[PDB]
Write a protein that binds this ligand. Structure first.
Ligand code: NA
Length: 129
């Protein structure tokens, strides 16, 4: 599923991402925009052999299990395929774990390089939230 901007914002808010760890909803929408283009099925292989999965491109080295990342942890205790569902619940729960790990949303390279410090409120403009 490819979410619309306001649809994803509303789903993220319902799942409790708005202001989670102090990151406004727009930060999460922006991160999903630049990580996956709002596509829940986005997968991207990294050179170290891990893969990023889903709307928030959660990595298989630490957070999910994909059975093909030797030496990997599965801290969200979830199959990586579950981060590709049209229902983003699993991705959000895992992102909550990720953003609490120490470096906040800097865990997402696209958020740090394309969202951090920008007018992230633009990402929720016009949404009935
Ligand atoms: Na893993």
């Amino acid at each position: 599923k490819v979410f619309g901007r306001c649809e994803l914002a509303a789903a993220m808010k319902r799942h409790g991402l708005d202001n989670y760890r102090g990151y406004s909803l727009g930060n999460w929408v922006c991160a999903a925009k630049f990580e996956s283009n709002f596509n829940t099925q986005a997968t991207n292989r990294n050179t170290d052999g891990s893969t990023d999965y889903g709307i928030l491109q959660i990595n298989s080295r630490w957070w999910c299990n994909d059975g093909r990342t030797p030496g990997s942890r599965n801290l969200c205790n979830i199959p990586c395929s579950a981060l590709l569902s049209s229902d983003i619940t699993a991705s959000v729960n895992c992102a909550k774990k990720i953003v609490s790990d120490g470096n906040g949303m800097n865990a997402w390279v696209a958020w740090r390089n394309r969202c951090k410090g920008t007018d992230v409120q633009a990402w929720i403009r016009g949404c009935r939230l």
